[PDB]
């Protein structure tokens, strides 16, 4: 994974990308298509482009570069935000508190029971299934961090 | 993963949690500690809590319940946000465009190349290492979505 400073470096350079996203998007697709020409074959609108000059002149290639880097930027920012809250919790629960995954299963059972008890009108079979899935994603994400840290859990 | 309706059900019941986070947190921890007493042994600062009555009377058990459910709520919301960034991209790139992970590796290397070319002063070795790791997490997260959608990328 990334450290806190590494995530901040990713966010910082993406700010520079966004200040000329058209130029960055063009240069990324030109590098991809010149380095790996087979990738051009996926693009009906671009597969005729041979030279860097032709690729630079394509309004459609420039538009697509912006779409790609916008989508990737959103994924990186949301990943960084999730990591910033998940990482410290996995770190403390692995290294200081030493909490096995089975204990996270026990507290997940308690959360599901309490929500069902308190809010049956907002916690029918489907909503309970949804929360069961959400807490399993949470436990699996902690377990993945545990494996990286070498903690058996 | 969860459907959009399933995430809505999770966030709807979490709104009820947030209306009394301390009460929900207390009830979750007392359910956990009464059902699985070995879990209470992990809390050195609750060594004075033996009985259900003592647990209900504890200021700090209730405060800890708030800490736990506040942290969990934040992680669930940030997970949902990142899932929502990945979903449309994994959908189209698995089912319509059929983009192999090797091609995602090629475009990741193109992004690193363009950032090194454009920002050598602000994309040194460490910042490049950070972005290399972030793009690998992106590819791995898409590969996991590919497997869920039944696409061999
Ligand atoms: C960082 C990696 C990538 C990102 C963020 C990305 C993002 C996007 C986005 C947002 C779209 C438009 C909406 C959609 O169809 O999902 C798109 C379309 C597309 N992508 Fe990607 N993509 C990436 C990598 C690739 C690669 C490596 C290829 C092929 C080698 C590829 C091929 C396509 C194709 C063929 C389309 C449809 C183009 C069109 O009909 O206009 N993508 N991509
Ligand atoms: C939904 C699951 C959980 C969440 C969100 C959670 C969250 C937290 C948070 C935010 C803290 C304070 C900051 C920190 O040290 O990381 C904490 C502390 C702690 N957690 Fe957890 N926790 C969870 C499950 C558990 C379980 C199941 C146990 C034990 C069986 C446990 C044992 C502890 C202990 C011993 C501390 C230190 C308490 C203190 O002395 O103040 N956690 N937890
Ligand atoms: O793309
Ligand atoms: O906790």
Curated annotation (Swiss-Prot), chains A, B:
It comes from the Eukaryota. InterPro entries: Globin, Globin-like_sf, Myoglobin. The keyword Transport applies. The keyword Metal-binding applies. Transmembrane segments: none annotated. The modification Phosphoserine is found at residue 3. Residues 1-147 form the Globin domain. It is an enzyme of class 1 (oxidoreductase). GO terms for cellular component: sarcoplasm. It catalyses: Fe(III)-heme b-[protein] + nitric oxide + H2O = Fe(II)-heme b-[protein] + nitrite + 2 H(+); H2O2 + AH2 = A + 2 H2O. GO terms for molecular function: heme binding; metal ion binding; nitrite reductase activity; oxygen binding; oxygen carrier activity; peroxidase activity. Disulfide bonds: none annotated. Nitrite binds at residue 64. Its EC number is 1.7.-.-, 1.11.1.-. GO terms for biological process: oxygen transport; removal of superoxide radicals. CDD domains: Mb. Keywords: Cytoplasm, Heme, Iron, Metal-binding, Muscle protein, Oxidoreductase, Oxygen transport, Phosphoprotein, Transport. Heme b binds at residue 93. O2 binds at residue 64. Monomeric. Belongs to the globin family. PANTHER family: MYOGLOBIN. Monomeric heme protein which primary function is to store oxygen and facilitate its diffusion within muscle tissues. Reversibly binds oxygen through a pentacoordinated heme iron and enables its timely and efficient release as needed during periods of heightened demand. Depending on the oxidative conditions of tissues and cells, and in addition to its ability to bind oxygen, it also has a nitrite reductase activity whereby it regulates the production of bioactive nitric oxide. This is Myoglobin. It comes from Equus caballus.
């Amino acid at each position: 994974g990334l450290s806190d400073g590494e995530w901040q470096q990713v966010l910082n350079v993406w700010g520079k990308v966004e200040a000329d996203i058209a130029g960055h998007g063009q240069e990324v697709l030109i590098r991809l298509f010149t380095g790996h020409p087979e990738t051009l074959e996926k693009f009906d609108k671009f597969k005729h482009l041979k030279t860097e000059a032709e690729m630079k002149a394509s309004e459609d290639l420039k538009k697509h570069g912006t779409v790609v880097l916008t989508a990737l930027g959103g994924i990186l920012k949301k990943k960084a935000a999730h990591e910033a809250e998940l990482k410290p919790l996995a770190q403390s629960h692995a290294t200081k508190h030493k909490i096995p995954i089975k204990y996270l299963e026990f507290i997940s059972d308690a959360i599901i029971h309490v929500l069902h008890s308190k809010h049956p009108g907002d916690f029918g079979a489907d909503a309970q299934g949804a929360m069961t899935k959400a807490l399993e994603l949470f436990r699996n994400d902690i377990a993945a961090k545990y494996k990286e840290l070498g903690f058996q859990g």
